[PDB]
């Protein structure tokens, strides 16, 4: 008869444990152990413990956004909102960098990753400043078409 809890009531009874999704209402002392279920969106218990109460669900504050909602048995998870990424040592959300005109997306700006840009290579261009657009392949004007404007790394070719 092993005490899977390592905790005893005042008379040698192995305190019962509050399973997953349930916290400890009142600590086993004179009596057994009182467990009550946690509140969805409010409290969770991801541990089968006879000493742990329902902990307060983590809330996303500021530039932090819900990446995962809080269940009774699992805490919530928060990440930097769409337009930002999390700075490693600061833990602060910084706005994603933008690949300026004549520069294009290489690696998307997500969570711990800030936008990785690229100076458009030979044969491509980037019309705008943002962090979603990759350098595009130039339009090749037809032998019959008047190349009004040629392709540069910042503006695509024009024709008629």
């Amino acid at each position: 008869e092993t005490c899977s809890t390592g905790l005893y009531t005042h008379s040698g009874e192995c305190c019962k444990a509050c399973n997953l999704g349930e916290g400890v209402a009142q600590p086993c002392g004179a009596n057994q152990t009182v467990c009550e279920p946690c509140l969805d969106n409010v409290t969770f218990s991801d541990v089968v413990s006879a000493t742990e109460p329902c902990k307060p669900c983590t809330e996303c504050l500021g530039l932090q956004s819900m990446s995962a909602p809080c269940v009774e048995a699992d805490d919530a998870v928060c990440r930097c909102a769409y337009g930002y990424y999390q700075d490693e040592e600061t833990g602060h959300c910084e706005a994603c960098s933008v690949c300026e005109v004549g520069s294009g997306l290489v690696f998307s700006c997500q969570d711990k990753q800030n936008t990785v840009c690229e100076e458009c290579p030979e044969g491509t261009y980037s019309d705008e400043a943002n962090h979603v657009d990759p350098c595009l392949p130039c339009t090749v004007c037809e032998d019959t078409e008047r190349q009004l404007r040629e392709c540069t790394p910042w503006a695509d070719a024009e024709c008629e």
Binding site: N19, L20, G21, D40, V48, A68, P69, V71, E72, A73, D74
Partner: peptide, 10 residues
Amino acid sequence: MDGKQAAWRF
């Protein structure tokens, strides 16, 4: 039914 007990998850 995460192994032992049953829970609501996404």
